[PDB]
């Protein structure tokens, strides 16, 4: 449930990971602006059915996208890359958040605009400006029990958000004395987080300009504080109980990851439904990547001289695992 009443207002190098989900996916993270080209290669030909999940970003304002005898490759193209990079393949508590991003396309009449809604670590709504639907599409397996009037309201509110973002695009362009030829992006995130007894504890409303943290005068006057706090402490938590109860079958299912150890020392875990995991080796830290089915995998290593890989132990810690 989006907030109806809407008060107006550095380049990061991409990192690429390549793997095949079950024992073909390319995970990119830390790349901004959104103008990315990514492709999967080498059955002598390109891949035809290349689709990607929704565009979003973590707390650090930086994006993270995913695409999913023969040898393959992944090619990545971004303005931070003078030369398109190729990477090879080797086989051997609760919270609600809403992320809004609007991108200026210099020349095109309608700037790009998408909105994403997340509960825990799973998205449940989709809206893309360039999409032909032009309506808030669910695409989630636990939200379809709602009625059409709900979706009409969501469409109306998301279009209000679109118009607001279109406006402050030019507003900040004038504020920082930039030109029309350059392309800039505005990002907004708001949400509210509940605990084990299903009541509000925390809330977030942050806003950034092209990946620079901006605000988390007009507003002071505009009396935003009370209404915003009421919305965060109000409609979120009731609706959030509602999605939690209607999404109980999936959202809370605890998944036990399966562990493996290899040396040819890598300790690896797969299929843990929540993202939070810890791996310890009694050391290089890599980012967690999904499997495409909602389950997650991670991995960590220790490098040892020849013959002495036997005196290190990996312990896997998790909310859904009893003992490391």
């Amino acid at each position, epitope marked *: 449930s989006l907030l109806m009443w809407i008060t107006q207002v550095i380049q990061r190098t991409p990192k690429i990971q390549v793997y095949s989900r079950h024992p073909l996916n390319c995970y990119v993270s830390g790349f901004h602006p959104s103008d990315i080209e990514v492709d999967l290669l080498k059955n002598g030909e390109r891949i035809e059915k290349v689709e990607h999940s929704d565009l979003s970003f973590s707390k650090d304002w930086s994006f993270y996208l995913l695409y999913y005898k023969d040898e393959y490759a992944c090619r990545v193209n971004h303005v931070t890359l003078s030369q398109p990079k190729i990477v090879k393949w080797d086989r051997d508590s609760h919270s609600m958040r809403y992320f809004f991003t609007s991108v200026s396309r210099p020349g095109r009449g309608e700037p790009r605009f998408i909105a994403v809604g997340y509960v825990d670590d799973t998205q449940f709504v989709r809206f893309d400006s360039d999409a032909a639907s032009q309506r808030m599409e669910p695409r989630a397996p636990w939200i379809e029990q709602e009625g059409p009037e709900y979706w009409d309201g969501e469409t109306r509110k998301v*279009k209000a958000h679109s118009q607001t973002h279109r406006v402050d695009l030019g507003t900040l362009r004038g504020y920082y004395n930039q030109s029309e030829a350059g392309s800039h992006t505005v990002q907004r995130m708001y949400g509210c987080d509940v605990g084990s007894d299903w009541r509000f504890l925390r809330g977030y409303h942050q806003y950034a300009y092209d990946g620079k943290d901006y605000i988390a005068h007009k507003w002071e006057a505009a009396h935003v504080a009370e*209404q915003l706090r009421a919305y965060l402490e109000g409609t979120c938590v009731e609706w959030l109980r509602r999605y939690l109860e209607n999404g109980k079958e999936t959202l809370q299912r605890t998944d036990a990851p399966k562990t493996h150890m290899t040396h040819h020392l890598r300790c690896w875990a797969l299929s843990f439904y929540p993202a939070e995991i810890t791996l310890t080796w009694q050391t290089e830290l890599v980012e967690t990547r999904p499997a495409g089915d909602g389950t997650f995998q991670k991995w960590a290593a220790v490098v040892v001289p020849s013959g002495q890989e036997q005196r290190y132990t990996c312990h896997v810690q998790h909310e859904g695992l009893p003992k490391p």
Partner: T-cell receptor
Amino acid sequence: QEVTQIPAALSVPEGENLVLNCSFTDSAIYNLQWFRQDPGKGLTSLLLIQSSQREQTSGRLNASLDKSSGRSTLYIAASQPGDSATYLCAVRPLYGGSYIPTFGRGTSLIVHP
Amino acid sequence: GVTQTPKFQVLKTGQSMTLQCAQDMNHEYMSWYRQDPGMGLRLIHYSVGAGITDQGEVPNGYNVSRSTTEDFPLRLLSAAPSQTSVYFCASSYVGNTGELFFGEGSRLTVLE
């Protein structure tokens, strides 16, 4: 959702305190507006009450909003002949996505010199 | 403020006339009202963002169209004797405070 104004007709001698009443059926609102209207010349905004405010003041004009009972009262002090006009009460919603206000019928006020 | 033109207009039945509403404080909510004598202040098409327009309670017989967040034209393609009324342009922010702003109004009269 429905706004009614009382008493849609008022006629007083100059210098008398005035009480005007606007009531609404739906209590989940975020706005309140009172507009003067001379026979023509459009609408002039007088007042604005938020969902967080119980009182509002502007010069010799005062107003109170009791959301639980769903009532709003406007107090005019020491009426002058210049206050002869129609007064309109308007409210805007909190949920729905529509942002369409619901205007009342209005109360006409004449103050004899 | 919000300026709407023209102030007065006389139309032969069957003509076409487009009233213009403009503002400079870059509001977002726009709407048209028609006020009838002793009947009420009824609503016409309203638009919340650029490119999106929805119907009100009296949609028949009217065009609107919004491509620029500063202007709003209300066009009558074929004026009718029942169109005789006074029209107001209501402009507002979204979410800022909720205050409305009305234009000076425009009088229309349609004669056979």
